[PDB]
């Protein structure tokens, strides 16, 4: 078999293949995650260079791993399918062997472990993908939001963004998001998520996707018109 060590250390102590995988993430479309008091919202950019697209059948950016956990990403699209598939298999495997659904922290730890394994295994390259994993643990009303990256490190976030121009939207979130008082309702949480994407997106038409996840496996994706109403209200307040 092909055993060639592709991810290796350089004289200055860097693994370039892992670092170049982060550059692939930088190229990817922007993704954002914001957790409110009783919910988590996942926002995703859709680049409008591609029109004549069939939005019914085109792979959506946010993927359900189980009925209570979702996963969005930034980077190589093809790579993300492999992580999602593995995550979905592990989710059913956990239910089968332990008789409880996975915690959001466990699922994140697994996906992060897969990414890490591909940084010190022969014949393979790292995943050019960073993920945002969100949801609610079984019989728990505390929101969960985690991030992973090609190196395999993961951590929990009150709010986080990844992908192209993520530096800008993170700047916005850092000054707008208050920890002592997070978005109390679904409206406030979605509004803040749309606002953050409007710093980067371009047009607020079909370029913004929003997915709300509430406790007890209550997951819904907002439509174009519902999002468009947020876009309208934000700019009308801005004209002042």
């Amino acid at each position: 078999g092909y055993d060639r060590a592709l991810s290796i250390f350089s004289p200055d102590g860097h693994i370039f293949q892992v670092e170049y995988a982060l550059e692939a993430v930088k190229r990817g479309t922007c993704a954002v995650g914001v957790k409110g008091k009783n919910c988590v919202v996942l926002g995703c950019e859709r680049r409008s260079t591609l029109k004549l697209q069939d939005t019914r059948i085109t792979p959506s950016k946010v993927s359900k791993i189980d009925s209570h956990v979702v996963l969005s990403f930034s980077g190589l699209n093809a790579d993300s399918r492999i992580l999602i598939e593995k995550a979905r298999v592990e989710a059913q495997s956990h239910r089968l062997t332990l008789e409880d659904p996975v915690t959001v922290e466990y699922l994140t730890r697994y996906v992060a472990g897969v990414q890490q394994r591909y940084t010190q295994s022969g014949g393979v390259r790292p995943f050019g993908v960073s993920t945002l994993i969100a949801g609610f643990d079984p019989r728990d009303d505390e929101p969960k939001l985690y991030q992973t990256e090609p190196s395999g490190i993961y951590s929990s976030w009150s709010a986080q963004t990844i992908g192209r121009n993520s530096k800008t939207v993170r700047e916005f979130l850092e000054k707008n998001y208050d920890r002592k008082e997070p978005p109390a309702t679904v409206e406030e949480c979605v509004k803040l998520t749309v606002r953050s994407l409007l710093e980067v997106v371009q047009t607020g038409a079909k370029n913004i996707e929003i997915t709300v996840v509430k406790p007890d496996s209550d997951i819904v994706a907002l439509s174009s018109e519902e999002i468009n109403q947020y876009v309208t209200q934000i700019e009308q307040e801005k004209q002042e």
Partner: protein
């Protein structure tokens, strides 16, 4: 040892691109243009054969349009030999699904499976990727008529109208201009041929330089029919639309 001669086909550039995928796409940009257009009552697949000869046996020839099953077909752009490897795998996958569930495979599931195979060659194994881009035209009872494309990266997307191969930039602009949502198959046939006629590198668009196919519910009652056009039938539709 052997390391000396390894090109390392599955690595990132400093900019975060996959070298071999990008170069495979460069190869595909020189291949004959293939166009797919989805309508409310069917799908059209049109494709241009590359600089042919008068001594080529056209009626028994197939380089662009292939049948995966009774409901799904593909248009090819790139290395034909590479495409046939993948096509036979896709045909088997469709039959595996049918044997397991006793239902015809949903279009997206087949597309995802092929796209995952392509992805694998970019991440592990040390082999060159498949220099092929597909346009999938298919039907199932969930989403109805569907158009997809896949490329050597293993990334796939859905479309109302799309082109692959040569002059896609020019072709996509022309499709974006004249396409409408309430369009029908007969209109889509005309759009596909008109687009090829303007984007072609050849002097004139003739029947012997084309492969053509439709997927219609224009089959007797609730069912779907695949029509791979014969040379004489391509010649007739060229006269009908007013190109020759």
């Amino acid at each position: 040892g052997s390391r000396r001669y390894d090109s390392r086909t599955t690595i990132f550039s400093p900019e975060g691109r996959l070298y071999q995928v990008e170069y495979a796409l460069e190869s595909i940009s020189h291949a004959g243009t293939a166009i797919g257009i989805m309508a409310s009552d069917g799908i059209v697949l049109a494709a241009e054969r590359k600089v042919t000869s008068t001594l080529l046996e056209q009626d028994t020839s197939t380089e662009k349009l292939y049948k995966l099953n009774d409901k799904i077909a593909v248009a090819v752009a790139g290395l034909t030999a590479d495409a046939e490897i993948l096509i036979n795998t896709a045909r088997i996958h469709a039959q595996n699904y049918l044997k397991t569930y006793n239902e015809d495979i949903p279009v997206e599931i087949l597309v995802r499976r092929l796209s995952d195979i392509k992805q694998g060659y970019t991440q592990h194994g040390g082999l060159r990727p498949f220099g092929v881009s597909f346009i999938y035209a298919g039907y199932d009872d969930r989403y109805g008529y569907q158009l997809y494309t896949s490329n050597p990266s293993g990334n796939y997307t859905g479309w109302k109208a799309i082109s692959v191969g040569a002059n896609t930039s020019a072709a996509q602009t022309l499709l974006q201009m004249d396409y409408k949502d309430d369009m029908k198959v007969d209109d889509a046939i005309e759009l596909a041929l008109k687009t090829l006629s303007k984007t072609t590198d050849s002097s004139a668009l003739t029947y012997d330089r084309l492969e053509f196919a439709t997927i219609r519910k224009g089959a007797n009652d609730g069912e779907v029919y695949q029509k791979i056009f014969k040379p004489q039938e391509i010649k007739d539709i060229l006269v009908k639309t007013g190109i020759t």
